[PDB]
């Protein structure tokens, strides 16, 4: 469930959340409110990208996982398919003049 965003990144979620939060320890130890008006606005506009990056990357996976008869078997090759040797079913396909069964 978290793999809709690469796990190389859930740590970098923290690092910047730390690097902004540490400024309150600059204020206390180590214009008006422009100092934090720039940070919180760039931060908001930044974290507002991570959500859209996540939402689209999730939708990009979820739409793809909504794309998956004899035709379905016929028009592909990953799934092997067959019949009992020298039985009426094998003969049916061997003698079928219908395209798809002929393909199979």
């Amino acid at each position: 469930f978290l793999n809709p965003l690469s796990p190389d990144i859930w740590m970098y979620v923290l690092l910047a959340c730390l690097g902004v939060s540490c400024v309150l320890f600059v204020i206390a130890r180590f214009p008006k409110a422009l100092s934090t008006r720039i940070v919180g606005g760039i931060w908001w506009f930044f974290t507002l990208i991570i959500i859209s990056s996540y939402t689209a990357n999730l939708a990009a996976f979820l739409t793809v996982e909504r794309m998956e008869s004899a035709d379905d078997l016929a028009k592909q090759t990953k799934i092997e398919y067959g019949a009992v040797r020298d039985g009426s079913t094998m003969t049916f396909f061997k003698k079928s003049k219908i395209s798809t069964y002929e393909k199979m």
Binding site: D8, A16, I38
Partner: peptide
Amino acid sequence: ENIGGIFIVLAAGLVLSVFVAI
């Protein structure tokens, strides 16, 4: 990849605050 394109814009506003008042 395109993941990291805005980690620099993130890192842009961080140093931009340091040079505001001191």
